[PDB]
Amino acid sequence: GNHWAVGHLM
């Protein structure tokens, strides 16, 4: 999905 951690982490 497009979680929040997907932006910072990934």
PDB file of C-alpha atoms in Angstrom:
ATOM      1  CA  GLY A   1       0.000   0.000   0.000  1.00  0.00           C
ATOM      2  CA  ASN A   2       0.920   3.665   0.369  1.00  0.00           C
ATOM      3  CA  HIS A   3       1.404   3.925   4.135  1.00  0.00           C
ATOM      4  CA  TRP A   4       3.206   6.841   5.785  1.00  0.00           C
ATOM      5  CA  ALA A   5       6.373   4.870   6.524  1.00  0.00           C
ATOM      6  CA  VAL A   6       6.515   4.140   2.795  1.00  0.00           C
ATOM      7  CA  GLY A   7       7.602   7.720   2.187  1.00  0.00           C
ATOM      8  CA  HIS A   8      10.161   8.282   4.936  1.00  0.00           C
ATOM      9  CA  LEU A   9      11.576   4.762   5.216  1.00  0.00           C
ATOM     10  CA  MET A  10      11.098   3.772   1.575  1.00  0.00           C
TER      11      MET A  10
END
